[PDB]
Ligand binder design. Structure first.
Ligand SMILES: [Ca+2]
Ligand SMILES: [Ca+2]
Length: 126
């Protein structure tokens, strides 16, 4: 139904696939490098054009938000989405971002806007 798209199987720019915090799904997660512009870009397929709720499963073991810009097929989707603390790195949490998609194959990209980089990201589901 909802379909999982694992971060570690996506296109990663300035990040690393890791597995040293428990509770991820798939074979690991992406640890964004601690730079602005680090990103993950998923290739997804949906049956019809329209709105989709993209459920981002992430962790942030710090008190500082790590915001992401989301874009869809190269156009901004959601700007400045905060990813706040989860207390600990294994405390994976979800946040929903609504992204407009075309029927069929689309790319969804989440890029870090601050020098902190992104939260750790397990997957998106939609
Ligand atoms: Ca990081
Ligand atoms: Ca994963």
């Amino acid at each position: 139904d909802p379909v999982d798209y694992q971060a570690e199987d996506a296109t990663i720019v300035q990040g690393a696939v890791e597995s040293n915090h428990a509770g991820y799904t798939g074979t690991g997660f992406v640890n964004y490098d601690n730079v602005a512009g680090s990103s993950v870009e998923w290739t997804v397929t949906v049956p019809s054009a329209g709105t989709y709720d993209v459920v981002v499963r992430y962790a942030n073991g710090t008190t500082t938000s790590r915001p992401l810009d989301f874009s869809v097929n190269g156009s901004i989707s959601a700007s400045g989405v905060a990813f706040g603390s989860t207390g600990t790195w294994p405390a994976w949490t979800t946040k929903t971002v609504r992204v407009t998609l075309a029927a069929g194959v689309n790319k969804i990209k989440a890029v870090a806007t601050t020098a902190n980089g992104g939260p750790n990201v397990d997957k998106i589901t939609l």
